[PDB]
């Protein structure tokens, strides 16, 4: 069995609808449901957690006085079930704020570190879904990468555009370059291959 964290941006910008009938928030919610349905129906043994960033409330183990704010652990590492399907579809809504995606990545790594203790997994995996419009701080990023390597975590980034231009903001361009630096540190030239579109996300998650 493998262990997977789905780390999803629900900040206010994800709710902006200018690429078809579904906003990026709606599209990512849809991919997450299809993936979780596949896992339930095949009776897979993999365990799946869900971390949301950009939420109006704060609920995570690291939140303390202006730190790791507006990040919520919606589902801990467990087998997926039908209650989770109901929650995702009805409860989970867009936030009215924005949050820091490296904060969210650390919350996800801390979750895997604690909740895989003493068990054997074939792989540990974090999948991030975002449009990269929110600002972030790079403080301690070298520590994040060192622990991704030691723990042998496989990382995948999914974006609602491929990388005529798309009108990406400077903040989005900075986020994309930071994703490239992270993936090259882990896997080299081949590492940049592990950056994908929402369109291709369901199939890449599954292999």
């Amino acid at each position: 069995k493998s262990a997977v964290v789905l780390c999803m941006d629900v900040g206010l910008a994800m709710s902006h609808s200018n690429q078809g009938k579904e906003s990026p928030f709606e599209q990512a919610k849809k991919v997450m449901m299809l993936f979780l349905q596949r896992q339930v129906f095949a009776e897979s043994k993999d365990e799946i957690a869900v971390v949301l960033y950009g939420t109006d409330t704060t609920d995570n183990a690291l939140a303390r006085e202006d730190q790791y704010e507006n990040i919520s652990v919606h589902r801990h590492l467990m087998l997926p079930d039908f209650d989770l399907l109901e929650q995702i579809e009805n409860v989970v809504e867009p936030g009215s704020v924005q949050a820091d995606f490296l904060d969210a990545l650390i919350v996800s790594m801390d979750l895997l570190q604690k909740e895989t203790l003493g068990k054997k997994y074939t792989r540990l995996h974090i999948a991030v879904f975002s449009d990269l419009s929110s600002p972030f701080s790079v403080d301690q990023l070298e520590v994040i990468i060192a622990n991704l390597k030691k723990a042998e975590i496989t990382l995948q980034f999914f974006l609602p555009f491929s990388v005529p231009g798309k009108g990406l903001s400077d903040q989005q361009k900075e986020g994309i370059e930071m994703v490239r630096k992270i993936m090259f540190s882990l896997d080299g030239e081949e590492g940049l291959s592990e950056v994908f579109t929402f369109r291709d996300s369901l199939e890449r998650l599954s292999i």
Binding site: L62, Q67, L102, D103, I106, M109, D110, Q113, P135, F136, S137, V138, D139, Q140, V143, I144, N147, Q171, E174, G175, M178
Partner: peptide, 13 residues
């Protein structure tokens, strides 16, 4: 993008 300080949890030391 900024450099606002953050504290990583102790296990990542």
């Amino acid at each position: 993008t900024t450099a606002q300080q953050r504290k990583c949890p102790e296990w990542m030391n």
